[PDB]
Design an enzyme around this catalytic site. Structure first.
Site, PDB file in Angstrom:
ATOM      1  N   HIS B  41       0.807  -1.213   0.000  1.00  0.00           N
ATOM      2  CA  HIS B  41       0.000   0.000   0.000  1.00  0.00           C
ATOM      3  C   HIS B  41       0.856   1.286   0.000  1.00  0.00           C
ATOM      4  O   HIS B  41       0.294   2.375  -0.152  1.00  0.00           O
ATOM      5  CB  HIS B  41      -1.083   0.000   1.085  1.00  0.00           C
ATOM      6  CG  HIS B  41      -0.591   0.198   2.471  1.00  0.00           C
ATOM      7  ND1 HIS B  41      -0.890  -0.698   3.477  1.00  0.00           N
ATOM      8  CD2 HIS B  41       0.130   1.210   2.990  1.00  0.00           C
ATOM      9  CE1 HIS B  41      -0.361  -0.187   4.574  1.00  0.00           C
ATOM     10  NE2 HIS B  41       0.253   0.955   4.331  1.00  0.00           N
ATOM     11  N   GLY B 143       2.545   6.212   9.583  1.00  0.00           N
ATOM     12  CA  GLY B 143       3.977   6.143   9.354  1.00  0.00           C
ATOM     13  C   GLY B 143       4.581   4.858   9.886  1.00  0.00           C
ATOM     14  O   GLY B 143       5.706   4.521   9.519  1.00  0.00           O
ATOM     15  N   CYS B 145       3.531   1.753   9.346  1.00  0.00           N
ATOM     16  CA  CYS B 145       3.448   0.590   8.475  1.00  0.00           C
ATOM     17  C   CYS B 145       4.810   0.105   8.024  1.00  0.00           C
ATOM     18  O   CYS B 145       5.732   0.899   7.865  1.00  0.00           O
ATOM     19  CB  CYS B 145       2.518   0.845   7.296  1.00  0.00           C
ATOM     20  SG  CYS B 145       0.843   1.309   7.803  1.00  0.00           S
TER      21      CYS B 145
HETATM   22  C1  LIG Z   1      -2.523   6.168   1.351  1.00  0.00           C
HETATM   23  C2  LIG Z   1      -3.099   6.340   2.725  1.00  0.00           C
HETATM   24  O1  LIG Z   1      -3.773   7.321   3.006  1.00  0.00           O
HETATM   25  N1  LIG Z   1      -2.826   5.393   3.663  1.00  0.00           N
HETATM   26  C3  LIG Z   1      -3.286   5.562   5.050  1.00  0.00           C
HETATM   27  C4  LIG Z   1      -3.908   4.274   5.566  1.00  0.00           C
HETATM   28  N2  LIG Z   1      -2.951   3.173   5.444  1.00  0.00           N
HETATM   29  C5  LIG Z   1      -3.462   1.959   6.071  1.00  0.00           C
HETATM   30  C6  LIG Z   1      -3.555   2.051   7.585  1.00  0.00           C
HETATM   31  O2  LIG Z   1      -4.487   1.545   8.201  1.00  0.00           O
HETATM   32  N3  LIG Z   1      -2.531   2.701   8.183  1.00  0.00           N
HETATM   33  C7  LIG Z   1      -2.256   2.756   9.568  1.00  0.00           C
HETATM   34  C8  LIG Z   1      -1.764   1.675  10.291  1.00  0.00           C
HETATM   35  N4  LIG Z   1      -1.581   1.651  11.616  1.00  0.00           N
HETATM   36  C9  LIG Z   1      -1.879   2.747  12.295  1.00  0.00           C
HETATM   37  C10 LIG Z   1      -2.396   3.925  11.711  1.00  0.00           C
HETATM   38  C11 LIG Z   1      -2.759   5.067  12.463  1.00  0.00           C
HETATM   39  C12 LIG Z   1      -3.299   6.158  11.848  1.00  0.00           C
HETATM   40  C13 LIG Z   1      -3.491   6.173  10.476  1.00  0.00           C
HETATM   41  C14 LIG Z   1      -3.146   5.097   9.713  1.00  0.00           C
HETATM   42  C15 LIG Z   1      -2.590   3.936  10.301  1.00  0.00           C
HETATM   43  C16 LIG Z   1      -2.661   2.962   4.022  1.00  0.00           C
HETATM   44  C17 LIG Z   1      -1.992   4.201   3.437  1.00  0.00           C
END
Ligand SMILES: CC(=O)N1CCN(CC(=O)Nc2cncc3ccccc23)CC1
Ligand SMILES: CC(=O)N1CCN(CC(=O)Nc2cncc3ccccc23)CC1
EC number: 3.4.19.12
Lengths: 304, 304
Positions: B41, B143, B145
């Site tokens: 992703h 951040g 991930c």
């Molecule tokens: C492209 C995009 O907007 N994303 C965001 C979502 N992400 C996926 C996602 O669930 N990420 C996150 C994982 N763990 C904690 C997290 C806390 C807060 C926010 C996002 C989190 C894909 C990439």
């Protein structure tokens, strides 16, 4: 989201752990620059521990009696000295992995990570706090002495604890890296009982703020209190008194959540008086006090 | 003595963390040999996350679009491929700090350490478990991930988890290092609800054995039970069924304490039915289920 009892990454400290043997005893040492720090009780026999005269026992030791091994390679000891309850073994080689470091003496309520070691090798890492009675509740077996507690500020390791003793009640005592014990404890196998292990109120409040930030809000109520009223309840429940300095320290968390510190105190007051009623906060059925306000901000902001 | 939620020393894994940027998104990668593993992703925009076609989105990406930085030095990407939900970015340099490693897919109930990272830099380490509903309860911000979960066996790191998603309920989902999600979760911003988060019975029993080893014995009673009788109570309390395989796994802890597994089951049965009555076990007011029997033996024996 989520909130865990998080320790600092241990790599910088793993690079400093060595094995120190004196006679039949093996424990851990901390190798920074050309000095290895370890508990002075490494020189004791079990009989010596009952009433040791460390200056006298140390006279019988020479540099060659302190065996220091870093991994599978032996270090040459070219000097030794006693500073309070630690020995400083000067070696002929600076630790090439010495991180930027400081020796700090922490106050009760402050948290730190411990890298539990045996035979100079790391076994695990966990978080704990200097209790108000100057004990720590660690996880230490025989051989763990000389394991250290620390905090990290980006690339500087602040060493605050070196493990020395387990009291008969299963709680732990140790020194800062200048060899001064926290609290009244001594490196002698004698009757040493700990005082009241009060709860670190400012840390509980910080953790309630972490709970609100991470979605657990059921405990928020319609009440407020004053520092004096809250402290009447805190004294009754063996909680540390909350000061205006603690209120100021909680300012950033109060601003983040929009919940005034004294309103959170009123929520904590009701939780103390009413209990949890079988409910949980951040996966805990008790009020957690080993996260400082700084720990909560750090974890909730992802400082590396 | 003492028993803590202990993570493995993180140094070996810190040496593998890198930053991966694709367009405007930055997350973490795991650099082992000449391959960097990261969530696929990383190629998505926020709009893409709603219904991504990863094969189609990946066509628009070239090696030079994947920016990989290890510390302050850039790595050259000479190939890229998608394996299930992870990308494998082949780089021209083998990680000089690659530890001995394995990729393992863990079962629910198994614990592991997580090295939470942001921008390829470690922020902290904590212990967690693969829940019976295939979620984990971590501490992950945006951040994080690409942060990984692992276990260590002396000098071999077994990587078992890579962080990908946070569900709307604040729980976490991710993959093994082959890119297969644990459970039914997908890398899409869609309605994904977790199933029942049952308690890992064999782990609770292991932790009650750790409590006895470490002096907390108040919960021991004069009763015994059978696997079938215990399981009637376990089902009622949303505990996982205990099998004879679990009883066999608890054998070493039963031998260490002299408490038959079914007698400990009867103690657990009474704790479930009667509650804790405001008492604690190893500093917890709830029955802890994120220590496996192996974790308890390891911590209680000081394996390095
Ligand atoms: C492209 C995009 O907007 N994303 C965001 C979502 N992400 C996926 C996602 O669930 N990420 C996150 C994982 N763990 C904690 C997290 C806390 C807060 C926010 C996002 C989190 C894909 C990439
Ligand atoms: C010379 C000698 O017999 N000793 C043993 C006692 N030690 C002091 C001591 O308290 N050590 C220990 C520290 N922490 C956990 C512990 C678990 C189990 C046993 C000992 C532990 C001095 C050196």
């Amino acid at each position: 989201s989520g909130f865990r009892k998080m320790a600092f990454p241990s790599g910088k400290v793993e690079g400093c752990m060595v094995q120190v043997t004196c006679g039949t005893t093996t424990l851990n040492g901390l190798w920074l620059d050309d000095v290895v720090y370890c508990p002075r009780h490494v020189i004791c026999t079990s009989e010596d521990m009952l009433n040791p005269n460390y200056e006298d026992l140390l006279i019988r030791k020479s540099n060659h009696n302190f065996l220091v091994q870093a991994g599978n390679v032996q270090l040459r000891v070219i000097g030794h000295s006693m500073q309070n309850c630690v020995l400083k073994l000067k070696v002929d080689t600076a630790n090439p992995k010495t991180p930027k470091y400081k020796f700090v003496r922490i106050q009760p309520g402050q948290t730190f990570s411990v890298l539990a070691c045996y035979n100079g090798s790391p076994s695990g890492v966990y978080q704990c706090a200097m209790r108000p009675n100057f004990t720590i509740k660690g996880s230490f077996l025989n051989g763990s002495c000389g394991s250290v507690g620390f905090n990290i500020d980006y690339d500087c390791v602040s060493f605050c604890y070196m493990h020395h003793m387990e009291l008969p009640t299963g709680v732990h005592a140790g020194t800062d890296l200048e060899g001064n014990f926290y609290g009244p404890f001594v490196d002698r196998q004698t009757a040493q009982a700990a005082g009241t292990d009060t709860t670190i109120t400012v840390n509980v409040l910080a953790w309630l703020y972490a709970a609100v930030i991470n979605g657990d809000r059921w405990f928020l109520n319609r009440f407020t209190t004053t520092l004096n009223d809250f402290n009447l309840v805190a004294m009754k429940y063996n909680y540390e008194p909350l000061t205006q300095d603690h209120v100021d320290i909680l300012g950033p968390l109060s601003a983040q959540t929009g919940i005034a510190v004294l309103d959170m105190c009123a929520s904590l007051k009701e939780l103390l008086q009413n209990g949890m009623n079988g409910r949980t906060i951040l996966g805990s059925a008790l009020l957690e006090d080993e996260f400082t306000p700084f720990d909560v901000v750090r974890q909730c902001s992802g400082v590396t």
